[PDB]
A paper describes a structure:
Human cellular retinol binding protein II (hCRBPII) was used as a protein engineering platform to rationally regulate absorptive and emissive properties of a covalently bound fluorogenic dye. We demonstrate the binding of a thio-dapoxyl analog via formation of a protonated imine between an active site lysine residue and the chromophore’s aldehyde. Previously, we showed the utility of human cellular retinol-binding protein II (hCRBPII) mutants as a fluorophoric tag, wherein an active site lysine residue (Q108K) reacts with synthetic aldehydic chromophores, giving rise to the formation of either an imine (Schiff base, SB) or an iminium (protonated SB, PSB). Q108K functions as the active-site lysine and forms a Schiff base with the aldehyde, whereas the K40L mutation is assumed to eliminate interactions between Q108K and Lys40, an interaction that could otherwise impede imine formation, and is also required to promote Schiff base protonation.
Subsequently, our investigation aimed to alter the polarity of the Thr53 position, which makes a water mediated hydrogen bond with Thr51 in crystal structures where both residues are maintained. The T53A mutation also red-shifted absorption and emission, but far more modestly (5 and 3 nm respectively, compare M4 to M1). We next turned our attention to the entrance to the binding pocket because our previous studies with retinal showed that introduction of aromatic residues in this region leads to the closure of the binding pocket and results in substantial bathochromic shifts.
Residue numbers in the entry: 1 to 133
């Protein structure tokens, strides 16, 4: 399904450190972030997404429209300019963030009862699994 609506609670988080290191997130932020449970809130209506990722100490907002390129200033992460585009490849939602970092973006998809989020940067891949609240 393409329906990714809901409140999603983190089950697993594999190689978050490697992904964050590839982004040049500072040491101290990485050490805290890797231990925290994330909650993802996704409001999806047609092509319009409003999403939030939240933890005890960090929060990451991003809204986008599928198929509409948008500039991003990742000021809370690694503080870079990227040109972002989110599109569907089958039932996989694919974000490419064009900029300095190669292979930067993510892929989100539903498999049974779970939401998968694959974060990429450089040679690093982080795989997160969420289940609905």
């Amino acid at each position: 399904t393409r329906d990714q609506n809901g409140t999603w609670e983190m089950e697993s988080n594999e190689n978050f450190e490697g992904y964050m290191k590839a982004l040049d997130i500072d040491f101290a932020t990485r050490k805290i972030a890797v231990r925290l449970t994330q909650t993802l809130v996704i409001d999806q209506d047609g092509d319009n997404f409003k999403t939030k990722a939240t933890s005890t100490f960090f929060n990451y907002d991003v809204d986008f429209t599928v198929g509409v390129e948008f500039d991003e200033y990742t000021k809370s992460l690694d503080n870079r300019h990227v040109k972002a585009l989110v599109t569907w490849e089958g039932d996989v939602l694919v974000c490419v963030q064009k900029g300095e970092k190669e292979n930067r973006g993510w892929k989100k998809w539903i498999e049974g009862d779970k939401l998968y989020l694959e974060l990429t940067c450089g040679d690093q891949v982080c795989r997160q699994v969420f289940k609905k609240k």
